[PDB]
Structure 1
Amino acid sequence: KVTLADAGFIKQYGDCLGDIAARCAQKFNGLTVLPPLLTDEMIAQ
């Protein structure tokens, strides 16, 4: 039900696209998102 827009990962290879910006800086303007320490599976555990 909840859609998480950031969901930080390794997105440099992902970023390259026809509509490159696709977005919330797309990293290029200096804004990134760090992953949580506890993954969703670890919280589920």
Structure 2
Amino acid sequence: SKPSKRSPIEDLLFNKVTLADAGFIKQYGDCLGDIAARCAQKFNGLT
């Protein structure tokens, strides 16, 4: 019944762990945030 077709236990495991990086395309974000907030935010060459 839920997206990703994970078990009740797997969603619990995923909700408990906080992922700092979560790699995906991030260039679209750019500014308008309170601050850039990163872990280079790509800008310093680390992805």
**TM-score, length basis structure 1:** 0.57
The answer to whether structure 1 residue 14 and structure 2 residue 35 are counterparts is no
Matched residue type, 1:28: F
> Share of identical aligned residues, percent?
100
Which residues of structure 2 form unaligned runs of 5+?
A: 1-15
Q: Where do residues 1-45 of structure 1 align in structure 2 (5 Å cutoff)?
A: 1-32=16-47
Q: Which has the higher contact order (CA 8 A, sep 6+)?
A: 1
**TM-score, length basis structure 2:** 0.55
Asked if structure 2 preserves the Cα contact closer than 8 Å seen for 1:15 and 1:26, the reply is no
Alpha-carbon distance in 1 for matches of 2:17, 2:28 = 26
